[PDB]
Ligand binder design. Structure first.
Ligand SMILES: CCCCCCCCC(=O)c1cc(O)c(O)c(O)c1
Lengths: 233, 226
């Protein structure tokens, strides 16, 4: 499809090539003081989140039809889907067999270098990365799934039906692609992994809550807004 | 002191007698994350501690002669940390058994489900508190010190600090009559344990199997610096 193509091109452009990975701050072994953190750790955590949102916005806008939605709908879909998108894209990108996390800037950091600011969450993201990698999801299938995480029913949408339409389009796209490779829903093996992902979004929220308590440095406003908006109370 | 006496009397009156401990629901054994009944029990147990602590606080000399707002503030800010400290002092971590202020006795596994990790950390603190072997008068002073302390928003911060000083003198003289800061060193880690409490409630509030009781929920929100 020209849709699939658009989706894949959008995806690849939203992340680094093996060519341009950034190992400058990579350290194969760091010795941290666990269960505890300084302001630099927390800043880096927030910076990394912030960087993903900016990248994800730009990625979202290259999804056909996404850019035509109500501006409020655009923001809503992006806020509701951000953590889950951050985790999924990071898990798909990273190499858990080397304990290394790869961010969308190309930045490469090791489990131990993130342990301070992310806490346990980073270990659990890595566990998910393993389990994701074991179902072997090709880039076009991923380019569809990521879009599907974003483009989905959320409470408060102004034009729920346009969103559902755009959902339907992307789901067909995925279906045809899956048939092109191997005539099917299948998929259920992958959805079996989706509880792990929900849980990981919760951990994310819990971590931010905790850092917000501690307040060594305050969250960036956009991240803080998402934190608050996505709380069902 | 008549102060110390007042503090000790207040403390002892605020919990169960070995006589009236309630082992009815105690179970040594069980198995095997949590359901609504676990969460309800957690909130019930917190709720049960509330009114006991207000009544205890009012028997502290001078406490009752603070601004009503200051009274409520000091109580809301100190509730979790008081619940934890009194529970840790009261419980027997060697036997894995938690004793609540109703006299209810439960085993660490019987409330692991609803407290999560926090219960282990409370029990860890209980061990550590006990190793210091803190006698009842010293405890009666410490608990008061957790309550009567600087909080953001106090109307009469200095009266509170004066009352602090009084109680700290009381404690110091008592320890000498019989560490001087080994027990005071405990309070920092109690704050940390409060944090876990908050984190747990946040988590339960996310999953929402049952909502918090209003009074507990109010404390949760009011004690958030944002
Ligand atoms: C690998 C673990 C699962 C990750 C991929 C699943 C994507 C999320 C998903 O299917 C999904 C589920 C919905 O109910 C929905 O309305 C949507 O737009 C997408």
């Amino acid at each position: 499809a020209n849709l699939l193509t658009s989706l894949v091109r959008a995806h690849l452009d939203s992340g680094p090539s093996t060519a341009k990975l950034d190992y400058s701050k990579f350290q194969e072994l760091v010795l941290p003081h666990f269960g505890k953190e300084d302001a630099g750790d927390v800043q880096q955590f927030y910076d990394l989140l912030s960087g993903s949102l900016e990248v994800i916005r730009k990625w979202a806008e290259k999804i056909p039809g996404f850019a035509e939605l109500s501006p409020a709908d655009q923001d809503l879909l992006l806020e509701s889907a951000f953590l889950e998108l951050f985790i999924l894209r990071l898990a798909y990108r990273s190499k858990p067999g080397e304990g290394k996390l790869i961010f969308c800037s190309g930045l490469v950091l090791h489990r131990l270098q993130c342990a301070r600011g992310f806490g346990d969450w980073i270990d659990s993201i890595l566990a998910f990365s393993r389990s994701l990698h074991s179902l072997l999801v090709d880039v076009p299938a991923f380019a569809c799934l990521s879009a599907l995480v974003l483009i989905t029913d959320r409470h408060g949408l102004q034009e729920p039906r346009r969103v559902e339409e755009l959902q339907n389009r992307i789901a067909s796209c995925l279906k045809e692609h899956v048939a092109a490779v191997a005539e099917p829903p299948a998929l259920s093996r992958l959805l079996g992994k989706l509880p792990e992902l929900r849980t990981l979004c919760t951990q994310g929220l819990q971590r931010i809550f905790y850092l917000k308590l501690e307040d060594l440095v305050p969250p960036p406003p956009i991240i803080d807004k998402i934190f608050m908006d996505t709380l069902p109370f």
